[PDB]
Amino acid sequence: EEEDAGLVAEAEAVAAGWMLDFLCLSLCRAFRDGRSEDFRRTRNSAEAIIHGLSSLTACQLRTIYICQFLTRIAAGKTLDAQFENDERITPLESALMIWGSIEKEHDKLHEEIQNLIKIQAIAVCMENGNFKEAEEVFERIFGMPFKSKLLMIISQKDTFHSFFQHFSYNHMMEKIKSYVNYVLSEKSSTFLMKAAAKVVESKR
Amino acid sequence: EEEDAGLVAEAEAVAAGWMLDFLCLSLCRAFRDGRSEDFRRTRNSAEAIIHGLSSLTACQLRTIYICQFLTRIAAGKTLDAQFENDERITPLESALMIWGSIEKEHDKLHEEIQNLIKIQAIAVCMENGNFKEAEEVFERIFGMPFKSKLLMIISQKDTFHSFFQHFSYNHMMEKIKSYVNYVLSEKSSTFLMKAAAKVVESKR
Ligand SMILES: CCc1ccc(OCC(=O)N2CCCCC2)cc1
Ligand SMILES: CCc1ccc(OCC(=O)N2CCCCC2)cc1
Ligand SMILES: [Ca+2]
Ligand SMILES: [Ca+2]
């Protein structure tokens, strides 16, 4: 009776792990495709499954970090969203913290995404007329030539500066989608998706 | 590209169906065991997965009805919970509506559970001092000898009447748990649980 209960709990943990990988893959695909409503609904399912998991492997923590990173990027222009206990941290600042914590290679693409999130974290404040908040985000992030241009734009209150058009929100999204394509290729072979794909193929 | 997107969506529907059955089995087990917090967390996961499913088979609708029925029974004493668009309907009345909609045999146990939910739907109002609400629940449900005793208890404001101790909330819960055991036996062979169980067994 107690051994049965324990074996059932172990099986529920195995199934939750399979469900987390599948939901991460669905979330990545919705982000890549721009399917806003599917992303919202999948994020809700991923959060609920995560609250039912206790012990995590290094791989499951990385998968969770990727889900959290994409959620903050999707909410990057929503300055009323509070993702951290410190209410001053903006969504792109929260995405930057996660980006620097994921156990992943620090290749050229990693650094390009990092710097585009930093510029846009300031740009989104400027675009909403939040000039003092842009200065505070700048101080938290920066924590020389790149830093100096940003402080100049902030002090001029140059909301639609040409610098923000060369390192735009769309360019940040496109670089992030390139990274998402690599996660989709790596997780396409996860148990639930493979089994579901085999079922669909066998009926064709 | 469009055929690939369509095949991916079909696989996501297959996986969501497997996830719904697994979450129903986990929800049933938490209800049977009295694991209140696991029931709450599993209900959250089941609701989110359900919102990501569009077309349902007759079997999936029955599985969803069972999840909804157990949620209303678990909230039976929570008279501030509103499960229907009509705010007057109490949680046990909402459970009674679902019980009469499930495609299932109407054996002796089905009717015993039905009548215990009817008595308790009135009993829970009386126990909270809501005498006028008990009369209104009575009129919505009833909709001869059984009906007459209840109307007499309601009019006397006999909160802790002996009739409610013979057909108690605990007796209703125990009869419902007997039914839950049959659902657990029928869904223990679902894809995700079987595969998870095989993994756990292979490591023993
Ligand atoms: C957006 C997806 C999401 C993910 C997790 C979460 O809460 C849990 C949480 O933060 N951790 C921290 C990381 C390890 C798991 C527990 C809420 C929402
Ligand atoms: C408690 C579990 C739960 C289940 C379903 C749900 O909403 C969806 C809903 O009602 N239907 C009606 C029945 C068919 C699916 C759509 C909310 C919570
Ligand atoms: Ca804010
Ligand atoms: Ca009420």
Swiss-Prot record, chains A, B:
Secretion signal span: none
Reported effect, residue 22 to P: Abolishes telomere binding
Location of the protein in the cell: Nucleus; Cytoplasm, Cytoskeleton, Spindle; Chromosome, Telomere
Region spans: TRFH mediates dimerization: 1-204
Transmembrane parts of this sequence: none
Induction field: Expression is tightly regulated during the cell cycle; levels are low in G1 and S phase and increase during G2 phase and mitosis.
Name of the protein in question: Telomeric repeat-binding factor 1
The organism of origin for this protein: Homo sapiens
Source species taxonomy: Eukaryota, Metazoa, Chordata, Craniata, Vertebrata
UniProt gene name: TERF1
Residues of the full protein shown: 60 to 268 of 439
